[PDB]
Amino acid sequence: MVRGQVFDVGPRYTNLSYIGEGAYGMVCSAYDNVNKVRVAIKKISPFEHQTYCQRTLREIKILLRFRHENIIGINDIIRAPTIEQMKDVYIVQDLMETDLYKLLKTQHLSNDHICYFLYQILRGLKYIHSANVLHRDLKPSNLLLNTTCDLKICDFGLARVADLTEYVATRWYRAPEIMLNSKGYTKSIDIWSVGCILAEMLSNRPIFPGKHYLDQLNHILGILGSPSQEDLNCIINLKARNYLLSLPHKNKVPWNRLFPNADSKALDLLDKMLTFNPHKRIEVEQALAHPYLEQYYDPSDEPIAEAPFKFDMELDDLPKEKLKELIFEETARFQPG
Numbered sequence: 001m002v003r004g005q006v007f008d009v010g011p012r013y014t015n016l017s018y019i020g021e022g023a024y025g026m027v028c029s030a031y032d033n034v035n036k037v038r039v040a041i042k043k044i045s046p047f048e049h050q051t052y053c054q055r056t057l058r059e060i061k062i063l064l065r066f067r068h069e070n071i072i073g074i075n076d077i078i079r080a081p082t083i084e085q086m087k088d089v090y091i092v093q094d095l096m097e098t099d100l101y102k103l104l105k106t107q108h109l110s111n112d113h114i115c116y117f118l119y120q121i122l123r124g125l126k127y128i129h130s131a132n133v134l135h136r137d138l139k140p141s142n143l144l145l146n147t148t149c150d151l152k153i154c155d156f157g158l159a160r161v162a163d164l165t166e167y168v169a170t171r172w173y174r175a176p177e178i179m180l181n182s183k184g185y186t187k188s189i190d191i192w193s194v195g196c197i198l199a200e201m202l203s204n205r206p207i208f209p210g211k212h213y214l215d216q217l218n219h220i221l222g223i224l225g226s227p228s229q230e231d232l233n234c235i236i237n238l239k240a241r242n243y244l245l246s247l248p249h250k251n252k253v254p255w256n257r258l259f260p261n262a263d264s265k266a267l268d269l270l271d272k273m274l275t276f277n278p279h280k281r282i283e284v285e286q287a288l289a290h291p292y293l294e295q296y297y298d299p300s301d302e303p304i305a306e307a308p309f310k311f312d313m314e315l316d317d318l319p320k321e322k323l324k325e326l327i328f329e330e331t332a333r334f335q336p337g
Protein backbone atom coordinates (compact mmCIF):
# COMPACT_ATOMS: atom_id res chain seq x y z
CA MET A 1 0.00 0.00 0.00
CA VAL A 2 2.88 2.34 -0.85
CA ARG A 3 4.59 2.62 -4.25
CA GLY A 4 2.57 -0.47 -5.15
CA GLN A 5 4.57 -2.51 -2.63
CA VAL A 6 3.30 -4.19 0.54
CA PHE A 7 4.10 -2.43 3.83
CA ASP A 8 2.25 -4.32 6.54
CA VAL A 9 3.14 -2.69 9.86
CA GLY A 10 -0.29 -1.69 11.18
CA PRO A 11 -2.32 -1.25 13.23
CA ARG A 12 0.18 0.31 15.67
CA TYR A 13 1.96 2.15 12.87
CA THR A 14 -0.26 4.13 10.51
CA ASN A 15 -0.12 7.08 8.11
CA LEU A 16 2.72 5.73 6.01
CA SER A 17 4.71 8.24 4.01
CA TYR A 18 7.36 7.29 1.50
CA ILE A 19 10.84 8.55 2.32
CA GLY A 20 13.12 6.68 -0.07
CA GLU A 21 14.98 3.45 -0.89
CA GLY A 22 17.73 1.48 0.86
CA ALA A 23 20.37 -0.11 1.13
CA TYR A 24 17.68 -2.60 2.22
CA GLY A 25 14.65 -1.46 0.24
CA MET A 26 11.72 0.83 1.01
CA VAL A 27 12.02 3.31 3.90
CA CYS A 28 8.85 4.97 5.20
CA SER A 29 7.97 7.32 7.99
CA ALA A 30 4.91 6.25 9.95
CA TYR A 31 2.81 7.40 12.88
CA ASP A 32 3.46 5.43 16.08
CA ASN A 33 0.05 5.24 17.74
CA VAL A 34 1.50 3.87 20.97
CA ASN A 35 4.24 6.48 21.43
CA LYS A 36 2.40 9.34 19.65
CA VAL A 37 5.47 10.19 17.54
CA ARG A 38 6.50 9.64 13.93
CA VAL A 39 9.16 6.98 13.34
CA ALA A 40 11.20 5.55 10.45
CA ILE A 41 10.57 2.00 9.24
CA LYS A 42 12.93 0.00 7.04
CA LYS A 43 11.45 -2.93 5.15
CA ILE A 44 13.95 -5.74 4.60
CA SER A 45 13.39 -8.82 2.43
CA PRO A 46 16.64 -10.81 2.72
CA PHE A 47 15.75 -14.48 3.09
CA GLU A 48 16.59 -15.58 -0.47
CA HIS A 49 20.19 -14.33 -0.37
CA GLN A 50 22.70 -15.75 2.09
CA THR A 51 24.61 -12.43 2.25
CA TYR A 52 21.44 -10.39 2.81
CA CYS A 53 20.64 -12.67 5.74
CA GLN A 54 24.13 -12.02 7.11
CA ARG A 55 23.64 -8.28 6.71
CA THR A 56 20.23 -8.34 8.40
CA LEU A 57 21.27 -10.45 11.39
CA ARG A 58 24.40 -8.36 11.79
CA GLU A 59 22.31 -5.18 11.68
CA ILE A 60 19.82 -6.42 14.27
CA LYS A 61 22.21 -8.00 16.80
CA ILE A 62 24.69 -5.12 16.77
CA LEU A 63 22.14 -2.28 17.05
CA LEU A 64 20.18 -4.17 19.72
CA ARG A 65 23.42 -4.62 21.67
CA PHE A 66 24.88 -1.12 21.27
CA ARG A 67 23.73 1.77 23.46
CA HIS A 68 25.17 5.16 22.59
CA GLU A 69 23.96 8.68 21.80
CA ASN A 70 25.85 8.73 18.51
CA ILE A 71 24.58 5.40 17.20
CA ILE A 72 21.09 4.73 15.91
CA GLY A 73 19.05 2.26 17.95
CA ILE A 74 16.20 -0.11 17.11
CA ASN A 75 12.85 0.64 18.75
CA ASP A 76 10.84 -2.26 17.42
CA ILE A 77 10.88 -5.07 14.87
CA ILE A 78 7.86 -6.29 12.93
CA ARG A 79 7.57 -9.77 11.41
CA ALA A 80 5.13 -12.65 10.93
CA PRO A 81 4.06 -14.83 13.91
CA THR A 82 5.49 -17.96 12.26
CA ILE A 83 8.90 -18.43 10.63
CA GLU A 84 7.24 -19.95 7.56
CA GLN A 85 5.18 -16.80 7.01
CA MET A 86 8.14 -14.50 7.71
CA LYS A 87 9.20 -13.09 4.34
CA ASP A 88 9.83 -9.51 5.41
CA VAL A 89 11.26 -7.84 8.49
CA TYR A 90 10.38 -4.25 9.40
CA ILE A 91 12.85 -2.29 11.49
CA VAL A 92 11.50 0.73 13.40
CA GLN A 93 13.87 3.57 14.29
CA ASP A 94 13.66 7.17 15.52
CA LEU A 95 12.91 9.50 12.61
CA MET A 96 15.92 11.66 11.76
CA GLU A 97 15.61 14.93 9.86
CA THR A 98 18.45 14.45 7.36
CA ASP A 99 21.89 12.96 6.71
CA LEU A 100 25.34 14.45 6.16
CA TYR A 101 25.16 13.66 2.45
CA LYS A 102 22.08 15.82 1.78
CA LEU A 103 23.34 18.47 4.20
CA LEU A 104 26.65 18.80 2.37
CA LYS A 105 24.80 19.15 -0.93
CA THR A 106 22.97 22.28 0.23
CA GLN A 107 24.70 23.75 3.28
CA HIS A 108 28.01 25.39 4.10
CA LEU A 109 29.35 24.23 7.46
CA SER A 110 30.98 26.69 9.85
CA ASN A 111 34.27 25.54 11.36
CA ASP A 112 32.52 25.05 14.70
CA HIS A 113 29.95 22.77 13.05
CA ILE A 114 32.62 20.74 11.27
CA CYS A 115 34.45 20.38 14.59
CA TYR A 116 31.35 19.23 16.50
CA PHE A 117 30.11 16.82 13.81
CA LEU A 118 33.60 15.34 13.64
CA TYR A 119 33.61 14.98 17.42
CA GLN A 120 30.33 13.09 17.40
CA ILE A 121 31.46 10.71 14.65
CA LEU A 122 34.65 9.86 16.50
CA ARG A 123 32.82 9.63 19.83
CA GLY A 124 30.44 7.07 18.38
CA LEU A 125 33.28 5.30 16.54
CA LYS A 126 35.28 5.08 19.78
CA TYR A 127 32.43 3.03 21.24
CA ILE A 128 32.20 0.88 18.11
CA HIS A 129 35.91 0.10 18.11
CA SER A 130 35.83 -0.57 21.87
CA ALA A 131 33.35 -3.36 21.15
CA ASN A 132 35.95 -4.79 18.77
CA VAL A 133 33.75 -3.95 15.76
CA LEU A 134 34.63 -2.33 12.42
CA HIS A 135 31.82 -0.39 10.73
CA ARG A 136 33.51 -0.82 7.33
CA ASP A 137 31.08 1.50 5.53
CA LEU A 138 31.30 4.97 7.08
CA LYS A 139 30.11 7.64 4.65
CA PRO A 140 28.01 10.85 4.75
CA SER A 141 24.71 9.09 3.95
CA ASN A 142 25.23 6.76 6.94
CA LEU A 143 25.54 9.73 9.28
CA LEU A 144 22.03 10.84 10.26
CA LEU A 145 21.18 14.23 11.81
CA ASN A 146 18.19 15.36 13.83
CA THR A 147 16.81 18.89 14.14
CA THR A 148 19.22 19.86 16.93
CA CYS A 149 22.50 18.84 15.25
CA ASP A 150 22.70 15.45 16.99
CA LEU A 151 24.53 12.93 14.81
CA LYS A 152 24.00 9.16 14.77
CA ILE A 153 25.97 6.49 12.90
CA CYS A 154 23.77 4.07 10.94
CA ASP A 155 23.75 0.80 8.99
CA PHE A 156 25.87 -1.93 10.52
CA GLY A 157 24.98 -4.54 7.91
CA LEU A 158 28.57 -4.54 6.67
CA ALA A 159 30.11 -4.50 10.14
CA ARG A 160 32.24 -7.39 11.36
CA VAL A 161 34.30 -8.25 14.44
CA ALA A 162 37.94 -7.14 14.32
CA ASP A 163 39.54 -10.60 14.19
CA LEU A 164 33.67 -7.57 -0.13
CA THR A 165 33.13 -7.81 -3.88
CA GLU A 166 29.44 -6.96 -3.44
CA TYR A 167 27.84 -3.78 -4.71
CA VAL A 168 28.00 -0.74 -2.46
CA ALA A 169 26.56 2.68 -3.30
CA THR A 170 29.97 4.35 -3.16
CA ARG A 171 33.64 3.46 -2.71
CA TRP A 172 34.85 7.05 -2.36
CA TYR A 173 35.41 6.45 1.37
CA ARG A 174 37.25 3.12 1.36
CA ALA A 175 40.84 2.89 2.56
CA PRO A 176 43.51 1.94 -0.03
CA GLU A 177 43.87 -1.45 1.71
CA ILE A 178 40.22 -2.16 1.02
CA MET A 179 40.46 -1.01 -2.60
CA LEU A 180 43.48 -3.29 -3.04
CA ASN A 181 41.56 -6.29 -1.69
CA SER A 182 43.96 -6.86 1.21
CA LYS A 183 43.17 -9.66 3.65
CA GLY A 184 43.96 -8.51 7.17
CA TYR A 185 42.87 -4.89 7.53
CA THR A 186 42.04 -3.28 10.88
CA LYS A 187 40.12 -0.52 12.66
CA SER A 188 42.21 1.96 10.69
CA ILE A 189 39.97 1.54 7.63
CA ASP A 190 37.22 3.32 9.58
CA ILE A 191 39.58 6.18 10.45
CA TRP A 192 40.35 6.62 6.74
CA SER A 193 36.63 6.90 6.00
CA VAL A 194 36.19 9.57 8.67
CA GLY A 195 39.09 11.52 7.18
CA CYS A 196 37.36 11.43 3.80
CA ILE A 197 34.21 12.68 5.50
CA LEU A 198 36.20 15.45 7.23
CA ALA A 199 37.64 16.60 3.91
CA GLU A 200 34.16 16.70 2.38
CA MET A 201 32.78 18.75 5.27
CA LEU A 202 35.60 21.23 4.69
CA SER A 203 34.88 21.66 0.99
CA ASN A 204 31.39 20.27 0.22
CA ARG A 205 32.84 17.86 -2.34
CA PRO A 206 34.34 14.36 -2.12
CA ILE A 207 38.13 14.36 -1.83
CA PHE A 208 38.65 11.12 -3.78
CA PRO A 209 35.80 10.87 -6.35
CA GLY A 210 37.03 8.13 -8.69
CA LYS A 211 35.01 7.21 -11.79
CA HIS A 212 36.15 3.60 -11.82
CA TYR A 213 38.39 1.13 -9.99
CA LEU A 214 41.92 2.17 -10.95
CA ASP A 215 40.82 5.81 -11.18
CA GLN A 216 39.94 5.74 -7.47
CA LEU A 217 43.57 4.92 -6.64
CA ASN A 218 44.93 7.59 -9.01
CA HIS A 219 42.90 10.24 -7.17
CA ILE A 220 44.43 9.12 -3.89
CA LEU A 221 47.98 9.08 -5.25
CA GLY A 222 47.46 12.44 -6.96
CA ILE A 223 47.00 14.03 -3.54
CA LEU A 224 48.98 11.92 -1.06
CA GLY A 225 51.80 11.25 -3.51
CA SER A 226 53.35 7.94 -4.55
CA PRO A 227 53.20 5.31 -1.80
CA SER A 228 56.44 3.65 -0.67
CA GLN A 229 57.10 -0.09 -0.68
CA GLU A 230 56.74 0.18 3.10
CA ASP A 231 53.34 1.87 2.82
CA LEU A 232 52.25 -1.15 0.76
CA ASN A 233 52.78 -3.73 3.50
CA CYS A 234 49.38 -5.43 3.39
CA ILE A 235 48.89 -8.89 1.92
CA ILE A 236 47.82 -7.75 -1.54
CA ASN A 237 48.00 -8.96 -5.12
CA LEU A 238 51.63 -9.02 -6.28
CA LYS A 239 50.83 -7.68 -9.75
CA ALA A 240 48.53 -4.96 -8.40
CA ARG A 241 51.26 -3.91 -5.96
CA ASN A 242 53.86 -3.80 -8.75
CA TYR A 243 51.58 -1.80 -11.02
CA LEU A 244 51.00 0.74 -8.26
CA LEU A 245 54.73 0.92 -7.53
CA SER A 246 55.40 1.64 -11.21
CA LEU A 247 52.95 4.52 -11.68
CA PRO A 248 54.38 7.99 -12.44
CA HIS A 249 55.75 9.60 -9.28
CA LYS A 250 53.35 12.05 -7.66
CA ASN A 251 54.39 14.56 -5.04
CA LYS A 252 52.25 15.05 -1.96
CA VAL A 253 49.90 18.01 -2.37
CA PRO A 254 49.95 20.31 0.69
CA TRP A 255 46.60 20.37 2.52
CA ASN A 256 46.39 24.15 2.74
CA ARG A 257 46.40 24.31 -1.06
CA LEU A 258 43.37 22.03 -1.32
CA PHE A 259 41.72 23.63 1.70
CA PRO A 260 42.93 27.26 1.77
CA ASN A 261 40.21 28.32 4.23
CA ALA A 262 40.28 25.38 6.62
CA ASP A 263 41.34 25.53 10.27
CA SER A 264 45.03 24.59 10.35
CA LYS A 265 44.47 22.18 13.24
CA ALA A 266 41.75 20.43 11.23
CA LEU A 267 44.21 19.97 8.36
CA ASP A 268 46.78 18.55 10.76
CA LEU A 269 44.31 15.94 11.96
CA LEU A 270 43.12 15.34 8.40
CA ASP A 271 46.75 14.63 7.50
CA LYS A 272 46.89 12.00 10.25
CA MET A 273 43.68 10.31 9.11
CA LEU A 274 44.46 10.11 5.41
CA THR A 275 47.80 8.32 5.61
CA PHE A 276 48.40 5.58 3.06
CA ASN A 277 50.09 3.33 5.60
CA PRO A 278 47.44 1.88 7.98
CA HIS A 279 50.01 1.41 10.75
CA LYS A 280 50.95 5.08 10.43
CA ARG A 281 47.28 6.10 10.54
CA ILE A 282 45.90 7.78 13.68
CA GLU A 283 43.70 5.74 16.07
CA VAL A 284 40.27 6.82 17.33
CA GLU A 285 41.36 7.84 20.85
CA GLN A 286 44.37 9.70 19.44
CA ALA A 287 42.12 11.50 16.97
CA LEU A 288 39.77 12.47 19.79
CA ALA A 289 42.73 13.83 21.77
CA HIS A 290 43.93 15.94 18.84
CA PRO A 291 44.13 19.71 19.54
CA TYR A 292 41.42 20.33 16.92
CA LEU A 293 38.85 18.62 19.13
CA GLU A 294 40.11 19.98 22.47
CA GLN A 295 36.92 21.91 23.27
CA TYR A 296 34.84 18.71 23.15
CA TYR A 297 37.23 15.92 24.14
CA ASP A 298 36.30 14.45 27.52
CA PRO A 299 37.19 10.77 28.19
CA SER A 300 34.99 10.76 31.30
CA ASP A 301 32.01 11.52 29.02
CA GLU A 302 32.74 9.14 26.14
CA PRO A 303 31.23 5.71 26.93
CA ILE A 304 32.88 2.49 25.76
CA ALA A 305 31.27 -0.91 25.30
CA GLU A 306 30.52 -2.92 28.43
CA ALA A 307 32.32 -5.85 26.79
CA PRO A 308 33.87 -6.59 23.38
CA PHE A 309 31.14 -7.64 20.93
CA LYS A 310 31.14 -11.34 20.08
CA PHE A 311 29.00 -13.32 17.67
CA ASP A 312 29.23 -16.50 19.78
CA MET A 313 28.87 -18.46 16.53
CA GLU A 314 30.26 -17.21 13.21
CA LEU A 315 27.85 -15.99 10.55
CA ASP A 316 29.41 -16.20 7.06
CA ASP A 317 29.38 -20.00 7.21
CA LEU A 318 25.70 -20.53 8.02
CA PRO A 319 23.25 -21.64 5.33
CA LYS A 320 20.61 -18.97 4.71
CA GLU A 321 18.00 -21.23 6.32
CA LYS A 322 19.87 -21.28 9.63
CA LEU A 323 20.39 -17.52 9.45
CA LYS A 324 16.63 -17.11 9.10
CA GLU A 325 16.13 -19.12 12.28
CA LEU A 326 18.55 -16.86 14.17
CA ILE A 327 16.78 -13.77 12.79
CA PHE A 328 13.48 -15.24 13.97
CA GLU A 329 14.93 -15.78 17.46
CA GLU A 330 16.51 -12.32 17.72
CA THR A 331 13.23 -10.59 16.85
CA ALA A 332 10.90 -12.72 19.00
CA ARG A 333 11.22 -10.34 21.98
CA PHE A 334 9.32 -7.69 20.00
CA GLN A 335 6.37 -9.96 19.32
CA PRO A 336 3.19 -9.77 21.41
CA GLY A 337 3.99 -10.83 23.93
Ligand SMILES: c1nc(NC2CCCCC2)c2nc[nH]c2n1
Binds near residue numbers: 019040095097098
Ligand atom coordinates in the same frame (compact mmCIF):
# COMPACT_ATOMS: atom_id res chain seq x y z
C1 LIG B 1 16.89 6.53 6.49
N1 LIG B 1 16.32 7.72 6.33
C2 LIG B 1 15.81 8.38 7.36
N2 LIG B 1 15.22 9.62 7.18
C3 LIG B 1 15.55 10.42 6.00
C4 LIG B 1 14.57 11.59 5.88
C5 LIG B 1 14.92 12.40 4.63
C6 LIG B 1 16.34 12.94 4.75
C7 LIG B 1 17.32 11.78 4.90
C8 LIG B 1 16.97 10.97 6.14
C9 LIG B 1 15.88 7.81 8.63
N3 LIG B 1 15.48 8.19 9.87
C10 LIG B 1 15.80 7.26 10.72
N4 LIG B 1 16.43 6.23 10.09
C11 LIG B 1 16.49 6.55 8.76
N5 LIG B 1 16.98 5.96 7.67
